Amino acid sequence: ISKKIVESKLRPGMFIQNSNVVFNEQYKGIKILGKGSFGEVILSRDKHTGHEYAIKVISKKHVKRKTDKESLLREVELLKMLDHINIMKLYEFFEDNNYYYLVSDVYTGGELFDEIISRKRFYEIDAARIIKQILSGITYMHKNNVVHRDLKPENILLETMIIKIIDFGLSTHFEKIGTAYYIAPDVLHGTYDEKCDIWSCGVILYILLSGCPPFNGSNEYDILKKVEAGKYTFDLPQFKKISDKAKDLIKKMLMYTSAVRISARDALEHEWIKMMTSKLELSIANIRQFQSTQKLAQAALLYMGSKLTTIDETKELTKIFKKMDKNGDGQLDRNELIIGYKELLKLKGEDSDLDNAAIEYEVDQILNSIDLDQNGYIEYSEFLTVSIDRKLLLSTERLEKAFKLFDKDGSGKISANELAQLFGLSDVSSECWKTVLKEVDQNNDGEIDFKEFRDMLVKLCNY
């Protein structure tokens, strides 16, 4: 459940400019922007011009290529020549023996739903303007023979408004929790055409208007089953106030047979879009429950995965430091610690400047957490103990942030029923979590607070 998906030494927001990491002898690494579709996104600065870019850094050893190199270079050349206000610009592609690099404009705005659910209220007109922009971008890209294939809220940035679609064109050439809701039966059945994008946008529209996905389930397998059948309904209370016009559009976007599914252009000119965007309060709270349940489940997964992964890596570092500790006093200096992390990834079988800088940064942040001796030596067991605590803290903070979103209008508590959804998405067995819920809910209220939720994740790593 947990250790498979995790098994990221750089943290979103961290400055790396002190490390003098340079990409392609041109772009200076400035700041880690986050984790993107197929690897890391780094704010970088052209050392000649000062122009800043977001560089997506994709690890070769972990990520695979579906097409030959000539196909990839031809699509990149096409991509470089396209411009649209709702499409994130790609400038360049390059590589070395460790990474693929994609240089794009600097991302503005947050993920679509995150930006919608930070606000107090959300209206039909907002949804229509959003979808109009998404459809404008898609229409343009299809007209230029570019298909996205992986369209979802995570790939749609909103600046509160201007929409930008990221990763438009990647998926053809390279091979989370929210994935399954958005993907078209076409691409599950391996039918290869542009209409899959209109299905994904129609799913997004359904969700914008109702706050609930049309093909839903407690886990991946159930969701993919509903998608497979392509059966959805407009029989939710939410849809009582939604016009026939909006419903008509969704119907045309979610046609199962792609040949009969409306095109992006015709969707763009649909009557609903014309009327709404020309010169009703939706359930933001449903959109929030949906989005925040996904985020908290992801954070719960990462908390367990990080805890378990760190235990394993600590045992291997302990063996490595034992060998290096020749006088047996348990003490090592900074360069010995660093060498030990490098040794570790040699046993894994990897040979990199960005990684070197990431290793020095982790080591230094652990050392900055300890009242260091002025001889330069550190007891490695203390180093590793502080290292464990630092990663639990970071994971706790991510859990905290996701919980804040989840509990915006709540009791400060999570129900058994919500716990079933979160752990359903995590693929954690009902008997494992119910057993742990017993230990943790001491007055049997059927509901627990944040710290109790966290203790439950700790115990699940021990079970």
From Swiss-Prot:
Coiled coil: none annotated. Optimum pH is 7.5-8 (at 20 degrees Celsius). One of its GO terms (molecular function) is calcium-dependent protein serine/threonine kinase activity. Its main location: cytoplasm. Pfam families: EF-hand_7, Pkinase. The gene is CDPK4. It catalyses: L-seryl-[protein] + ATP = O-phospho-L-seryl-[protein] + ADP + H(+); L-threonyl-[protein] + ATP = O-phospho-L-threonyl-[protein] + ADP + H(+). Its EC number is 2.7.11.1. This is Calcium-dependent protein kinase 4. Ca(2+) 2 binds at residues 371, 373, 375, 377, 382. It is found in: Cytoplasm; Cell membrane. Residues 28-274 form the Protein kinase domain. Myristoylated; myristoylation may target it to different subcellular compartments. During male gametogenesis, myristoylation is required to initiate DNA replication but not for mitotic spindle assembly or axoneme activation. Not palmitoylated.
